[PDB]
């Protein structure tokens, strides 16, 4: 039943008594459900240390991973170039999933095509699929570039991307001068950040490998910036703004912030902004190349150091106070441009907010997860705030990255109770937050489920989630935030301190029970 | 637009395609003629997508794991293969269910084998057995396991059937191997077929020799309703208010026991014909259970379907059906009185997967809105046979439409509203045309039944008449 | 008792059993408390319509006001001028309270002095207090300007500010050339915004009244911007940024964003930025003067139109889409500068966010309160979003402003269930949100108490608070937000939609009870 | 000391209204306090001080509320006595569970010739309710000290003697009152738990978490324990002179001073109270010893620029006097780069008194003094 004046959506329409009785009858009559006391017993068991010991003994089963596959990152990298179509040689279901994922994160159209390889291509390869797809894509969507990645099917059957594209150019399916960079992005190796790295290396190699004779390092007075897999448009914007404030010439390669933030003015723009082909062609002429996320740009680093002869600086992600300072100092040294007074004032204002909020931030325990560079930058910033990152999880991390994060933790008194986990999923993290409860969680929308589980144990056991990372599906326009530089540090600090204060307000809202501490001034 | 206008528009959109692509896509676009009962004479469907054309079709894994098997709450479904397929499909479909997630329900969880290079090179059968053992260790209250194959499983020569048989014998557990590799078929339709075959082969006949279940003459099963936003619950409350006992309801909020009990029912009520026609026909052939399609979308279709369902039983059920219709008449009449004046004479273009492009028309007509364009991602020719009698004369029909094709159709038709998925929502929002997600109900719902009709009318009014659509042009431009 | 490893603050230390027993003994033995059943009965009575009728019959009693006194606004106006020390003629406790209020809101040092008028000055006036205070202030803090306002004591005993300052200059306490603008700011008239208006009018008159002969309108090709009482630094920043993007010469009079956002670099800066005396002197030479908050800048408008001969445009506060568009178009017409493509893209991006969030925003019911211009801008933006501002409360609003807001509401179909209240306090709004429950409240931190009250009636009756306005005390760094322009509209939209989504997530977190709607994607 | 403020210089000193409404009368929870005058004084002091209390706000407790007459021009010109009477009637109507009303005068009340005493007497006789007029006009005096004196005089004249001829209260030889503790973050509760663990009965505790009946019961106790001497010495000496109740100052800041004060208080009673005091000290010794062991090495040798507070700082190994810490001015020292903490006006943390408060105090001192934010004021390129 519905009242036309107050229409109920599924919640709380299904909380009505008739729906409750219907669901109870369905459960009791036909579902053969386990008794509720057995369910409670099993849940309590899953909250225990013995269950955690069994959970961490897993070797073959992955539950609730915190990573994606390579072609997603390859598509994100391809989206950062001007009038460039991401083209995933393989099965179309992969492209449908990639587009849906990026649509849900960015709430914007995501352009990507597939050559629709099927059972026939499983025994003959996808050469005909490549030819037809390249021709159809160029004829239909009129791109300046087509950037080709692979699905797991084409990787398993062993399709040769280079030979397929060369043959497509030979039989006239596409013009011989049309830029078609390619990258093998096996989904069974690494994660989405690995796919971003592979795609960027493929594009850079396509545009620079065979034209290195006329290249002179530092002839265009620019610094190349490689952002890596980045899903905060504010990060691109803050990097560009900080570099422009310093008066430093720069070339941001793979810049998708325009195509992922197109205006609503009555027309659809398939392409917007992006790195030009001339930018990639002139990239070896830069003074140097700075990798914003070095821990998943290793192949790109090898190509840039081996081919462009750029002495890539050893820079951490420009996250937090110390690492933003290091990034700015390195940029100043490379370009010769002094750090302006505006950036000094911005750093001072970030320090001022840190001093203002240190009383609420100090000692807070956090369980965080995400990509390696983002995770380590967050850990460093939390250490700078006096916080304790007790559980540090990176499903796509490696041993060297874990060693670096352990070295960071050992350099701070606030990393004493911190453990770093690599190759562990969010079921492991749920066990960790149940057995060693932190004050808060930091991560993507998936952690919301963990929060639910904690609330099922009790209100005092609930671990609230702070949505920083990728992907964020249950909140709107959080992809416009910044996590890099001083502005990103200020936004992160504000989010953390206000989450703490919101939790304190919720815990002290009980009238005549806990509202003695429901303070107006915090 | 007249029929000649639509045909000329179709030709103009096909102009830019290459010869092969244009020739293939010509057969998938048509101008509706309601008198024609054989859609094969005007449209061709269930064919391979043209490479590199930005299609919206999913894979067989999406149609099997994401649609048919995933909503089964008390079962654990393993995305066998690399992490990506399971990660992108995790909790992306709003198959509503009741349960304690992680203990006795696992719908929104992502179980995967997380294939690495060594698993590709040396196979994943041993890893599958170890994973099944670990699943048993860590989730003891699961009532069954399904193994949904991703693309690499069928290419590296893995034998998941033997692993399923051995582990099921060892653990006395139902383990259903589904060969739903994404490259199979051309869309999610083959995934539906493969999942239905797996249901028939491994789950449906489990209680063939069991006669302990007590049956009544009013036993019905709900097949093909996936409880998107609670749609199946809103249909089930109407069915049970009619005096019927809904023994089984899958996949949405479905349990494995309900699937096993389905062969014991007297009638099968199929909501999505496309995804469950195989299992319905098999059940009719084997257990002699009649099946029929019902449409609870909009008060007119809901009332007609309720009367058709009651006509299959005695006079008491028909009396209860009339009582239910009388009880719910004032509610949907009030909803119509509130929202039809704000929605009269507004044209709608739709493009959804395989059932909804024709099923939801009646509710739009209930609110005073006319549908001028419709199409399917993966429907067969029988779906179009059912569609052409529902669509208006000289209306556009598109099969496996491309992004450019549908964009040009919308640009040259100018509808008041468009109903499609998330991959076109923002495309058409940036063009200034109100959009309603017809897959997830735009995170709203349910839309079935009378309560669903109220929610649907409210959503249509709030999106079509939102002020944000009048502000896309800057006043200085 | 306390555990050294896990130390408890007041919450939840006083929830311990021994503290509970001690408090129970204290209440039962000596407090002579009313029975808890009587307390519940009275609380339930306070939530009824009969209590609302009694509450709205009040004529003499004010409970929980939503306004401050004039000298607070006068101090805020004075802080916006370069090297200017706010000086309040009257009692010291007023200045102490002003500084405490502004420190709590901004979390920054706030400069203000008093002449410490006492019992003796209540008989002979504060002439000697004025002389000594001016001399001591100029000697100790070395300001370039002293802006003088009054407390209620000085306004009751009729102290002549002009005569006192002239006598101080005549007798050598301060130089005759030192700029000492003054304004009478009676705290029993209007509110803090009236004090801001009076102080700005006094400063403008002091710098421009006697030198109007050589003034030519539009000779400096600039537009004067008067922001009014503004407690968001982002609003000053966004106005300046939008005018700089347009290429429009502007003079922002009373700009305090610099002195309220000083960096923490180990040095205390007493003054920072602000409007220079040269800009105030040259203000009559501008093309026009734009009043950002015209509903509390009436005296300023009268002075600017009567003395500077500036045709002040009839502009609403640049809040929300339509009013930001009108402000930009008026600036373009006045200055002759076309609106650039960047501002058009920002407007389109705001519209895109609106289309992305309209489903969650449509039909939501809001109670709201604050200052008149801010309240009407918020109402306009909510009507643009499809929201319902059911309860509109403005303690310092007047009848003409109420008529304007009623006209705004009648122009929208979403203003049908809206009522505007002037002269009502937060107890009236408590009664309103109990008897006519909105989905959310929008206001300053005081509304938190109302939320507590609603939660005492039940979780289903709780009205969550959204902290937009002044003052915000229980959250950190919210004063750095923006409410003006497209940027401010985007920030407000994000806050509203994410508050709605957070409330929905909280309402659907119950496992096996409401978590069927705990959707990952929203 | 205690002289007039120099005009034109910034200072922290409040007014007489702040010392009366904000300090003495406001924490009284079951009374309603009307800020008589314009809106500003009541608005700025609303929930400004963390005088913790237990009650239902708006029903039986009113501490964080703002009751004001909201004076306008007509009230200034023609007086506000009629407005005060109407406001008192409206308060009675809308807040029936209030156990008393105080009228705190703001500045214009003392300048326009308003007679709030006559209104208070008439309305109190009419409604059989205690209405306390306080002439705490802000211009009176040079600081909040005169506000404390005026508020104490009002307490003595209108509340304290309400049960002089009442003998129904059953008294015990271990009856003590806590006078002048305003329960900042629960300080008075942390002191009261220790006092009751000693076998003493705390009949009265005001202003913090204080009720009017407790103030009326204060003349019935055997000992008065004054925390804030400078705000309650007048009432303490009045009770000593009139009722013969001895009073003493207690210092529960830091374990050493807490132990000394507990022993001094127990010395005023029989041997059973002394034995219970020894038991309490023995029980709490390991807790504050562990607190010292954890936090003293992190704070040893640090210099504090600020007895009452010296004891706790010295218990943490800290030197009291380039200060490493200093006990409106907070942000000024904050921007100079010196870590700052309010040792007696803290607006966020607490309690700091008693053994339970000592742990919080040590944690807060370690948190503020050793926070990395103070090491980052200088940019590495400067
Ligand atoms: C019963 C209660 C008085 C309590 C009392 O004073 N008891 C006598 C005092 C003695 N005790 C009970 C407090 C201690 C004992 O003596 C215990 S014993 O004698 O040892 O058993 C009176 C006083 C205040 C009254 C409410 C308010 O007006 C608001 C409202 C107005 C409407 O128009 C009618 C409803 C409302 C809710 C009223 C209901 C009720 O009418 C209240 C609670
Ligand atoms: S199963 Fe099919 S695409 Fe019949 S794969 Fe798809 S929950 Fe659609 S038009 Mo998403 S054939 Fe169901 C469908 Fe229809 S996921 Fe849902 S809405 S009625
Ligand atoms: S009464 Fe005094 S200024 Fe002793 S007027 Fe002041 S609640 Fe301070 S240092 Mo605010 S002599 Fe109390 C005080 Fe101390 S208001 Fe509180 S913190 S212990
Ligand atoms: S068509 Fe379908 S979704 Fe595609 S892979 Fe194949 S079953 Fe799966 Fe999977 S991990 Fe990523 S998303 Fe693919 S490249 Fe492989
Ligand atoms: S010293 Fe004290 S706080 Fe000052 S007025 Fe006097 S009693 Fe009050 Fe009040 S409304 Fe504003 S803040 Fe004043 S100017 Fe008057
Ligand atoms: Fe968008
Ligand atoms: Fe600050």
Author numbering:
A (entry chain B), C (entry chain D): 2 to 523
B (entry chain A): 4 to 480
D (entry chain C): 48 to 353, 361 to 375, 417 to 422, 426 to 480
Show the paper's wording:
Nitrogenase catalyzes the ATP-dependent reduction of dinitrogen to ammonia during the process of biological nitrogen fixation that is essential for sustaining life. The Fe-protein mediates ATP-dependent electron transfer (ET) through its [4Fe:4S] cluster to the intermediate [8Fe:7S] P-cluster in the MoFe-protein; the electrons are subsequently shuttled to a [7Fe:1Mo:9S:1C]-R-homocitrate metallocluster, the FeMo-cofactor, within the active site of the MoFe-protein. The active site FeMo-cofactor contains a [7Fe:1Mo:9S:1C] metallocluster coordinated with an R-homocitrate (HCA) molecule.
A resulting 2.37 Å resolution structure of MoFeAlkaline-inactivated demonstrates that HCA is lost from the active site under these conditions. In contrast, the MoFeAlkaline-inactivated cryoEM structure exhibited asymmetric disorder within one α-subunit, which likely stems from the averaging of heterogeneous intermediate states. This poor density corresponds to residues 1–48, 354–360, 376–416, and 423–425, which lack traceable density in the more disjointed α-subunit (2.37 Å resolution). In the MoFeAlkaline-inactivated structure, both P-cluster ligands and one FeMo-cofactor appear well ordered, but within the active site of the disordered α-subunit, the density corresponding to the crystallographic location of FeMo-cofactor appears distorted. The disordered active site clearly lacks density for HCA, while the ordered active site shows reduced density at the HCA coordination site. Within both αβ dimers of the MoFeAlkaline-inactivated state, Phe α300 experiences a rotamer rearrangement with respect to the MoFeAs-isolated and MoFeAlkaline states. The movement of this bulky side chain within the disordered dimer is coupled with altered positioning of three histidines, His α274, His α362, and His α451, towards a coordination site for an unidentified ligand ~8 Å from the terminal Fe1 of the FeMo-cofactor. In addition, while density around the FeMo-cofactor is poorly resolved, a rearrangement of the His α442 loop that normally ligates the FeMo-cofactor can be partially traced into smoothed maps and may also participate in this coordination in a tetrahedral fashion. Given the nature of the density and the geometry of the coordination, the bound ligand could be metal. Interestingly, the Trp α253 flip is observed in both α-subunits in MoFeAlkaline-inactivated, where previously it was observed only in one subunit under turnover conditions.
